[PDB]
Design a protein around this ligand. Sequence first.
Ligand SMILES: COc1cc(C(=O)O)cc(OC)c1OC
Length: 283
Amino acid sequence: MEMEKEFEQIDKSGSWAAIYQDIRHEASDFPSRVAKLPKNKNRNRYRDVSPFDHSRIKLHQEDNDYINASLIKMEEAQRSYILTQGPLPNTVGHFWEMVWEQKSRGVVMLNRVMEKGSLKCAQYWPQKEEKEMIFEDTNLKLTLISEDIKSYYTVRQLELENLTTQETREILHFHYTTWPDFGVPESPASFLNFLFKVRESGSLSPEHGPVVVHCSAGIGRSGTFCLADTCLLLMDKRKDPSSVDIKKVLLEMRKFRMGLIQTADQLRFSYLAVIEGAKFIMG
Ligand SMILES: COc1cc(C(=O)O)cc(OC)c1OC
């Protein structure tokens, strides 16, 4: 049933919680044995957050292929995304190796390095042109080319170098800066404006490798990001954009990664973004 009618009635009523919980109860339960090996212990930021074996990204490394990252593949909607945790001090190098092997064009970041007085991730990119970073473990180098600072987001151009072969690769870093410490944004406009810019650069397009998106854990914030985009897209694609059911798309995405969207609030945000979003691509 029509999204807005649905959202109007879930609100009126107060039921966001009920609905979130039902999604939670029917979500897929696939194994995660590799994440759990003992040898893979410093490569995981949260214990209740793992990547399924069947959809995890392997590092092209002969000694430890393990990384906390997942490939979400949406069939109908012709889109692929990689969702992953914020890098830890020992995985910084692995992070950048995946970007390279996966042939990604963009990197989407939805958190701040420090939120609520605590560290949420490592400072994994260089902050001055002349102050480059070196990934000894992975034989890669990272260089800051340009910065463009905005009110609600920051975009950075980055250059990766195979030390090995002197090969280079230009990467695009999209950093959403203003998700609040507590809660959800009031209005979705800014996040939507941030999506479209992501879209506009080609970073989600098929002639490139899949886009890498992270927050802290890689599932709440990050899940909102792609849920909203997929849906928007389906709405342009189908005959009746009124059939797209957000709850179904989410359960689907979750066949690929656990816990996409972490709170009822977060689910309701998701709706708003989609409703407003569509206002644009139906006019
Ligand atoms: C309501 O169901 C569908 C409707 C449309 C459409 O084009 O309206 C496309 C679909 O995907 C193939 C559907 O999924 C089964």
